[PDB]
Amino acid sequence: ENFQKVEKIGEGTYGVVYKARNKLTGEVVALKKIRSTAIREISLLKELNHPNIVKLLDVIHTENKLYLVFEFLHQDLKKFMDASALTGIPLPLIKSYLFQLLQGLAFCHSHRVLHRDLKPQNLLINTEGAIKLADFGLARAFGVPVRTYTHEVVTLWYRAPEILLGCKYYSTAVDIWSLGCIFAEMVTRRALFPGDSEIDQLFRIFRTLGTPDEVVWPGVTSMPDYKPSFPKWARQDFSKVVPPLDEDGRSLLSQMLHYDPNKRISAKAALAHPFFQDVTKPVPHLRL
């Protein structure tokens, strides 16, 4: 075809990602082979360009197969986090990454585009200290199946509680929740809420942040999947949840994990939090 397959980077919810070379340009790209309303909405993402969004270069619809051609980056944050686990990611780099991802979300949210499935494998990094949001807008266009293309289990670890409770019309707040979970994991070096079922995911959230009620989340007891029989756990201290982190960091995280999505901090407001007063742009040491 037009591309030389270099390797198979991975497999995910919708399809398989290849590293490939454009035989005509020499451009090295990521090619996602997937497996309509979806066509126009994916194609619209070609216009959603920002330095912290993986660039969607082209969409190809042929013989009932869908190909997305993406900017290639050499590593994802899950691999970087595993690689950094003995020592931890230094806080100035955690802060730079969080700041850049908040700029990306602020851009997307201002254009009324949700990610809805943020996770470490959807965050890509380069040698220059940049981090980029990948697969932005794909879930709205394809739905989110319960199992992935190759059999694999869908990760619930970063899912906002309003989604778990069956809210049909969730908002940009769901991306802030996910990024909060990722922030905490980068600090502690273990996932904050590693649920292995939807109810385990929910109850893990409840056992840390307390079972929500009408005081802290007006409307919660009327959500579709809310049950009065939910156990009532007390809330824990964030100093216990992400211990090493300073009070600026814990303050910001608490605002990104607010239960009530209407009160959860926006990306734009998060960028102004005092946590970022000394933000810089360090480079990671990447071994490629």
Please give the annotated binding residues for ATP, written as ranges.
9-17, 32, 71-73, 76, 119-122, 135
Give me the sheet containing 131-133, strands edge to edge.
Answer: 75-76, 123-125, 131-133
Site for ligand ATP in 209-248 (CB under 6 A): none
Q: Which amino acid is at 73?
A: L
Residue tagged active-site, from 58, 82, 117, 213? 117
Nearest to 285 by CA among 76, 9, 84: 84
Binder of ligand ATP out of 34, 109, 113, 135 (CB under 6 A): 135
SS3 172: coil
8 Å CB contact between 75 and 120: no
3-state SS of the chain: helix, strand, coil percent to 5?
Answer: 35, 15, 45
198 binds, among ligand ATP, Mg ion, none (CB under 5 to 8 A by kind): none
Segment near ligand ATP (CB under 6 A); pick from 13-21, 157-165, 188-196, 201-209? 13-21
Would you give the end-to-end CA distance of the chain in angstroms?
28
Binder of Mg ion out of 52, 100, 103, 122 (CB under 5 A): 122
Question: Which segments are annotated as binding site for Mg(2+)?
Answer: 122, 135
Q: What is the spatial distance between Cα 249 and Cα 281, in angstroms, rounded to a whole number?
A: 17
Segment near ligand ATP (CB under 6 A); pick from 121-129, 159-167, 242-250, 274-282? 121-129
Binder of ligand ATP out of 42, 107, 117, 141 (CB under 6 A): 117
**Residues across the chain:** 288
Q: List contacts with ligand ATP (CB under 6 A).
A: 9-14, 17, 30, 54, 70-73, 76, 117, 121-122, 124, 134-135
User: Which positions lie near Mg ion, rule CB under 5 A?
Assistant: 12, 122, 135
